[PDB]
Every structure is written in structure tokens, then in C-alpha cells.
């Protein structure tokens, strides 16, 4: 288990450890901003657990302190058991049918407590967003009313700012059953995928090239993969091949530049290639100084780049005749070709 940034309630922590053998309490020694409690272990020496309170409303448990401290795993495990295990570490919850005249009274009826004060943020015509803070328990819930749809989105960790705003909304606009929902989402649908999942996918698909990736290339490819692996339902997918084609345009340039072929803007790639039938091939003056593998990777790379970019990075004066891709399997066919090409550009 992981005992860091626990969403423990800000108050109710002094009385939180009194049901085991309660006994000596106190705050954390020195500049720690927390608590560190020592108590008598059963028939043993004294045990201490140091639980420090973080900048936001999170608590962090430390039981690895020494001097019979493994009894601190007891306080650690009841702190594990105090908050609902199925609840999210940070909540995003959106409700429908709210206007500004319905949302401001909740904010000003939930800002008259002990140390709870909200703050106004940007006031755009697209969607209004507020910032409810607390000045005793270090919590901030950000609350947006999207103006056009009248949608009240509230985001943040379930600590005090969130709890009191949720209760004031459930009590002044007669939505009191909202305490019972935990999840409401689209069934079977994939989230945009985390960066690190996308990165490990890129690594197994880059093969022997991954340690050699330029940082800009890796950042482009990983962005594209965050969206590609979500399997998204789009009316068009061309945008998902932008990272591959731009990266090719970058790797090829570098490789060619180091092979004695500086690709300039006035000239372009065109200067070193011929197009007899359908593939571009390095010109003999240039091919004569490279090994065949290098000829083939460079020419295959340029040929794919040029065929796909010709229409995917431009539009026709007809507009409704511009090349489109309305199918995810089609897009992925191109992208997997491009990954082979990028890898070989680095590896060959």
C-alpha cells in the first residue's frame, strides 16, 4: 500500500487515534507542520508515528522512524481504513441545469463558515469558473459554470472546501441525494491515455531506435499516442498523423544532413531525388557514396513523407475535395508504416 497524500479529514484527526489503547498526543516536532504521536505499545517499549500535513489537504503517514516504530503501522492502517476506499483521490463531477443566479448564492452561503472563503476567477462568456478556498484546512475546490449549456462542473479532492460546497448545493437547490453517486461515466469508453502508458508503447514500437529519439520527436509521438490509444470517435483522423509526418520531416533532415546532404529551404528535399515511376530514389551522385540500406531507408522515407504530406498538410481550392481520413484503422495503417520508417531512419 501507499501511505502518501491520504485524503484524511482535516479536523477529527486528534480524536482519530483513541480506540486502540486510549496515550500521549502532540504536534510534530519542529518545522514539520503536522503531528507526531508517541504511545505505549502493548507490553512493549514506546512507539511513535509521524503523520505530517501537506500543502494541500493531504496527509502523509510515516511509520519508518525507529525505536519500536513498527507499532506505528497500526495507526498507519487505521488511517488507511478511515477514508472510503472506492472514492477517487481527486473528483471531477458535473451536473446539469444551473445558471449564475443559482450558483452564486451557494458560493456565498458556503463562505460564511469558520475559515472558508471563495474567490472569483476568469469571467468568460464561454464558461464561468470560480475558486473556493479554505483558510484553515488548506483546501481549494474549483467550480465552473459553463454558460452556454448551464453545466456546473466541480473539481478537486474531497476535503472541506468540496464537502461544504457539495452540502450547500445539496441543501439550497434540493439535490440532496447527490451524496450517493460515486461514478457516472460512459460505459466501455476509453480515456485519453496517460503519458507513461503512451511512452512505454512508443518504446516497444521504436525497438532499437528509442534511446536515439530526439526529444522533440519523442514529445510529438507520445502526444499523438495519448490520443491514438484512446480509440477516439472523431469525424476525421488526419490530425492524428501530424506527429508521424512532422517527425519524419525532422529525422530525415538530420540523417541526410549527417550523410553529407544539408537539406535547405530554398532547395528542399527535391534536389537529391528522382521519381522515375512512383518512388523517389536518391540520385546516383548521392547514392554512390552510401550503402544500399541507407539508400533504401532514405528513399522510402522521403517517398512516404511526400505522398502522404502532399494532401494531408494542404487543402484544395475546392475545399470539399481535400484529402480526409474518416476511419481509425486507415489512420493506424499509416501510423504503423511511419513508426517502422522513423525507427529505421535512426537504426540503419
Amino acid at each position: 500500500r501507499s501511505y502518501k497524500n491520504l485524503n484524511l479529514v482535516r479536523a477529527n484527526i486528534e480524536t482519530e487515534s483513541r480506540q486502540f489503547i486510549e496515550q500521549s498526543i502532540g504536534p510534530m516536532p519542529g518545522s514539520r507542520a503536522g503531528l507526531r504521536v508517541v504511545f505505549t505499545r502493548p507490553g512493549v517499549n514506546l512507539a511513535t508515528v509521524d503523520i505530517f500535513y501537506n500543502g494541500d489537504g493531504s496527509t502523509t503517514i510515516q511509520y519508518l522512524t525507529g525505536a519500536n516504530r513498527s507499532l506505528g503501522q497500526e495507526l498507519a492502517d487505521h488511517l488507511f481504513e478511515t477514508i472510503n476506499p472506492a472514492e477517487f483521490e481527486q473528483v471531477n463531477m458535473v451536473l446539469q441545469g444551473f445558471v449564475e443566479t443559482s450558483v452564486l448564492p451557494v458560493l456565498e452561503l458556503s463562505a460564511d463558515e469558520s475559515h472558508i472563503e471563495f474567490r472569483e476567477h476568469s469571467r468568460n462568456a464561454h464558461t464561468v469558473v470560480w475558486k473556493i478556498i479554505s483558510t484553515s484546512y488548506q483546501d481549494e475546490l474549483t467550480v465552473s459554470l459553463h454558460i452556454t449549456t448551464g453545466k456546473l462542473q466541480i473539481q478537486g479532492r474531497p476535503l472541506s472546501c468540496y464537502r461544504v460546497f457539495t452540502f450547500n448545493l445539496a441543501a439550497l437547490l434540493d439535490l440532496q441525494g447527490l451524496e450517493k453517486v460515486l461514478i457516472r461515466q460512459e460505459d466501455g469508453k476509453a480515456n485519453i491515455v496517460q503519458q507513461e502508458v503512451a511512452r512505454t508503447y512508443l518504446q516497444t514500437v521504436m525497438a532499437d531506435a528509442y534511446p536515439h529519439l530526439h526529444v522533440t520527436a519523442e514529445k510529438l509521438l507520445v502526444s499523438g499516442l495519448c490520443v491514438k490509444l484512446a480509440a477516439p470517435d472523431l469525424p476525421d483522423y488526419c490530425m492524428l498523423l501530424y506527429p508521424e509526418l512532422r517527425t519524419i520531416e525532422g529525422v530525415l533532415k538530420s540523417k541526410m544532413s549527417g550523410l553529407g546532404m544539408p537539406v535547405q529551404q530554398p532547395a528542399g528535399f527535391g534536389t537529391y531525388f528522382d521519381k522515375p515511376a512512383a518512388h523517389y530514389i536518391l540520385k546516383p551522385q548521392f547514392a554512390a557514396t552510401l550503402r544500399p540500406e541507407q539508400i533504401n531507408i532514405i528513399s522510402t522515407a522521403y517517398t512516404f513523407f511526400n505522398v502522404e504530406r502532399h494532401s494531408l498538410f494542404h487543402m484544395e481550392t475546392v475545399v470539399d475535395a481535400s484529402r480526409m481520413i474518416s476511419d481509425m484503422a486507415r489512420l493506424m495503417g499509416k501510423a504503423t508504416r511511419a513508426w517502422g520508417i522513423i525507427k529505421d531512419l535512426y537504426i540503419v
Binding site: 512512383a278 494532401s311 481550392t317 475535395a321 484529402r323 480526409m324
Partner: protein, 120 residues
């Protein structure tokens, strides 16, 4: 960059023009204008069907019509035609042309699975 596949196909439809590679024929519409005026009357008026398969893939905007007035393709008249609204003889002569000139498909944006998915 293009191939005229049929001429005076209907009364209304004066020609059928198919892309022969990844370049879009509608960016060289002056060339088509000159070829049409040579194969048809000098200043013809009617409709032109464009098959953009090798530039657009087997996509929802593969087929586009444009009006032609006094021998000029009017670029602001493009209307996308679904494949199921294209007469079968036009479709089968386009398929014949593709199988009879495989280098058009080699020069296309199609994938191999695309290359045989429209053949099938």
C-alpha cells in the same frame, strides 16, 4: 495527373475525370479544361464527375461533381456524390481502368488492403 474516362456519358454529365496518382486533379483544372475543350465542344456546359480515389483514398469525398459553364470548371460548384448514386457503368469503367493501369494505384495514397478492398 488525371485521366478522362468517358465523354458525353449522359446528356447532363459531359465527362468523367479520374486521378492517376496522389496529386489532386482539381489543382490543375486548366489542363482538364483544355483537354475537355479538345475532346468536346470548345465551350461546353454541363456537369463533370471527378473520381479522386488515388488522391483521396476510398473515402466519403472520393466522388465530386463540378459545373462547367462555357468550357470552364466552376470551382465553387463542387458537390460530393456518394458512391451509391454513381451509375454502375461509370463505376465499372473506373474499376476497369484501375485494373488496366496498376501504376495509378502504385502512385496512389491507398494501402494494399485498400488496393484490393475496392477491386472485388
Amino acid at each position: 495527373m488525371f485521366e478522362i474516362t468517358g465523354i458525353n456519358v449522359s446528356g447532363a454529365l459531359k465527362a468523367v475525370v479520374m486521378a492517376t496518382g496522389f496529386e489532386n486533379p482539381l489543382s490543375s483544372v486548366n489542363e482538364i479544361e483544355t483537354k475537355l475543350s479538345a475532346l468536346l465542344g470548345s465551350e461546353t456546359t454541363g456537369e463533370i464527375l471527378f473520381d479522386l480515389l488515388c488522391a483521396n483514398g476510398p473515402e466519403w469525398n472520393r466522388f465530386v461533381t463540378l459545373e462547367m459553364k462555357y468550357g470552364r470548371i466552376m470551382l465553387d460548384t463542387a458537390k460530393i456524390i456518394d458512391e451509391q448514386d454513381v451509375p454502375t457503368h461509370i463505376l465499372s469503367k473506373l474499376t476497369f481502368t484501375l485494373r488496366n493501369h496498376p501504376e495509378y494505384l502504385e502512385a496512389s495514397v491507398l494501402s494494399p488492403d485498400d488496393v484490393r478492398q475496392v477491386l472485388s
